[PDB]
Design a protein around this ligand. Structure first.
Ligand SMILES: Cc1ncc(COP(=O)(O)O)c(CNC2C=CC(CC[C@H](N)C(=O)O)C=C2)c1O
Ligand SMILES: Cc1ncc(COP(=O)(O)O)c(C=O)c1O
Ligand SMILES: NC1C=CC(CC[C@H](N)C(=O)O)C=C1
Ligand code: NA
Ligand code: NA
Lengths: 428, 427
């Protein structure tokens, strides 16, 4: 990788949520292995991000590699219309067995935003089949569910700048962000806003959608499990469907296999992604109940009306199967728990830094919330120079390392976080 | 795959656009090679579908396989936020170079539906940045652009059953399906389109269409003059033109991009399917410097999109290998030869009672029938003839890999001709 490569990139390749006219530097990566990224210049970095939550087994995992390669020898891809195959059957068997019992129908898809679009269409069609007029969704502020239009319609109107689409996006219902903390106690006052919205609109709501326990892209917030317990019952009483978006939280990140387990509730529709494939390639899954799946098929349409070109991709299903096989060992329960204790201990000192507003930790997620926004170009350069890959965002400096990270590797991460927030050098 | 494996699939796995209650037979595929699918019981089938148009180089292609395994050795995936890599860079150089000049900025994403959503968002943000109140899209009837909410809002309201979402989908503008065939041009065809453009030109963010071929909405093949006329109309009104070539891209209609038939360049280009040689999902939406900068110079400060797996190294490497195969140029004659054989071998369907029309363009052969095909029965019959062909609605069509052999293509067409004789397989 030459500097002409980097110039081409800067001038012709869009990157996620980043200006094409006022660019910040990007770092060229050549390879990766275990918990390290390897830059083109040979510099090796400890990954604190898991490539956005997904690489829970790290990079170049032998089990993942061998499974992907074996699938390539049989067939990387074949269409899923009128056809089925072992990787898909194998993955759906595991998905069904590992999630709440009522969740037993699987619709595989390409991306997380699409899995959400799928969950929403399922809710709309479900009610359209029962002859009811339910077309609205009830969600929480600070929620994020994807960038496609449907998903955008249930994201925080602020964070996602809904003023850009005012008039195009449908107007859904936004209860206040849950206030009670996962580190703290329950407050019954938290529920007034949500309760108010439900009473006023209980009749037009097709479903409730939320991220269980951790609201990610919307502030890395961690709220009280009592919330899910409540929402599940309200939904049960009103006959409304519950959509849980575990695209970020699925597969052990929060300390439990699925974050819904923190409340011991099961949703009607469950969306998975990211760690599903061990972060090797995009794949998503939306699981639902027999009740939902059958109802839709008996309506006008005759079928749930969705079907992406690469649905069921054998290659990605094989990787996902290998990723779940690793998790079947159970070794993750202990890795995540130990990561939890080290993040609590080693980030605790940050609370005393001037620039810091809050330190919070759950499973393999450690968050340092600051008072002012980070200077991206500057803080990123600093992290790289310490030999770590940490990608902060706004006022959040956070870690979500692979579950196989070594204590020494984790310590490099937390020490770099602690040092970054010691002064205002890297702020504004 | 045991019988219990198949039982599980049927009861627990949702398949595309198909019922969970009256589910219809699926066939268990164990592997694939060349232009053939291989079932669990060893039966071999000539693929007439290219896995929904994507596998233009067939299956288990050594050049595609090697590029994939090699990229796996380096890293199948790494995030694209603040990071870049070679597969993405190399793929982007090819896309920019192979497309019309103005298209020089690439937004990679995961799937076709998403690529269309990206194109729509680019248009909305573009106009938001120029302070213009423009939120309508102008599209054609019989068009199909995907399954996500934004994409649905520009699909044919009848074919896509818009009544189901009536009230959720934004109301867009739908000009008449283009009548002139790919055939003689009739100026009267433009009346609909013009009537919508005049009354709404002040409102319209972009015109979106599939060039030359409207696939899923009916395999319709229209006259290139439309593209010429729409491009000029868009230039005049300062409206953006979005060309969805997710199905037409990479050689399918006889040219690299269907837009060439009219020698036109859109403002935004959507690509997918054949992009990776049908090995795994990936998409790209290309646009101009004007669009890309305007957006970044607006209030949001950047284009507001960024999926987790954006720029996936593995997919990018596969796509690089797919584009390299095309670089050899061989597809040019492969497709022309297929076109010839399809025209010749499907011509006899014009004597069959069940047939309404036979039309062909590049590696697309269509036998539109007089009545609703019975997909399950016909599917079984095709499997028994040793071929894979998936009908729908009133179309029995073929879109084979570019490398299909003459005797293999002969099977598909013979089966098609045999199928339509006979009332058996219909309604
Ligand atoms: C022109 C065009 N634009 C967008 C998309 C969406 O791409 P995805 O990758 O999101 O799907 C497509 C996809 N086209 C389709 C091709 C075939 C089928 C199936 C039709 C029929 N019901 C059958 O099963 O045989 C559906 C969509 C596209 O073409
Ligand atoms: C909770 C959650 N939902 C949905 C998405 C959307 O996933 P994608 O970026 O693959 O479309 C992300 C990322 C996420 O974190
Ligand atoms: N669901 C997600 C959406 C966006 C991201 C990226 C968020 C932030 N813009 C960042 O760059 O880290 C991560 C997850
Ligand atoms: Na289950
Ligand atoms: Na170009």
């Amino acid at each position: 990788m030459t500097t002409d490569d980097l110039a081409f990139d800067q001038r012709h390749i869009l990157h996620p949520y980043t200006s094409m006219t006022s660019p910040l530097p990007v770092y060229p990566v050549v390879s990766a292995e275990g918990c390290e990224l390897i830059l083109s210049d040979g510099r090796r970095l400890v990954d604190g991000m898991s490539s956005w939550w997904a690489a829970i087994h790290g990079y170049n995992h032998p089990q993942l590699n061998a499974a992907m390669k074996s699938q390539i020898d049989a067939m990387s891809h074949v269409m899923f219309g009128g056809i089925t195959h072992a990787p898909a059957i194998e993955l759906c068997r595991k998905l069904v067995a590992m999630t709440p019992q009522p969740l037993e129908c699987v619709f595989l898809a390409d991306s997380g935003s699409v899995a959400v679009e799928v969950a929403m269409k399922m809710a709309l069609q479900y009610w359209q089949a029962k002859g009811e007029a339910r077309q609205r969704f009830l969600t929480f502020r600070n929620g994020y569910h994807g960038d496609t239009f449907g998903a955008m319609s249930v994201c925080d109107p602020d964070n996602s700048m809904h003023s850009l689409w005012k008039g195009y996006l449908p107007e859904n219902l936004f209860a206040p962000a849950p206030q009670s903390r996962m580190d703290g106690e329950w407050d019954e006052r938290d529920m007034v806003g949500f309760a108010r919205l439900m009473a006023a609109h209980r009749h037009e709501i097709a479903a409730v959608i939320i991220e269980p326990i951790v609201q990610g892209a919307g502030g890395m917030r961690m709220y009280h499990p009592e919330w899910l317990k409540r929402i599940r019952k309200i939904c049960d009483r009103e006959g409304i469907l519950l959509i849980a978006d575990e695209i970020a939280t699925g597969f052990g990140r929060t300390g439990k296999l699925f974050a819904c387990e923190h409340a011991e509730i099961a949703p009607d529709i469950l969306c998975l992604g990211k760690a599903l494939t061990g972060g090797t390639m995009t794949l998503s899954a939306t699981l639902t109940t027999r009740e939902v799946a059958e109802t839709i098929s008996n309506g006008e349409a005759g079928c749930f009306m969705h079907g992406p070109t690469f649905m069921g991709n054998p290659l990605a299903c094989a990787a996902a199967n290998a990723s779940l096989a690793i998790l079947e060992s159970g070794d993750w329960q202990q890795q995540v728990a130990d990561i939890e204790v080290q993040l609590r201990e080693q980030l605790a000192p940050a609370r005393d830094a001037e620039m810091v507003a809050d330190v919070r930790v759950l499973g393999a997620i450690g968050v340092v919330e600051t008072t002012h926004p980070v200077n991206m170009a500057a803080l990123q350069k600093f992290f790289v120079e310490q030999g770590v890959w940490i990608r902060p965002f706004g006022k959040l400096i956070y870690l979500m390392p692979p579950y196989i990270i070594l204590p020494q590797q984790l310590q490099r991460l937390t020490a770099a976080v602690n040092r970054a927030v010691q002064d205002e050098t890297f702020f504004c």
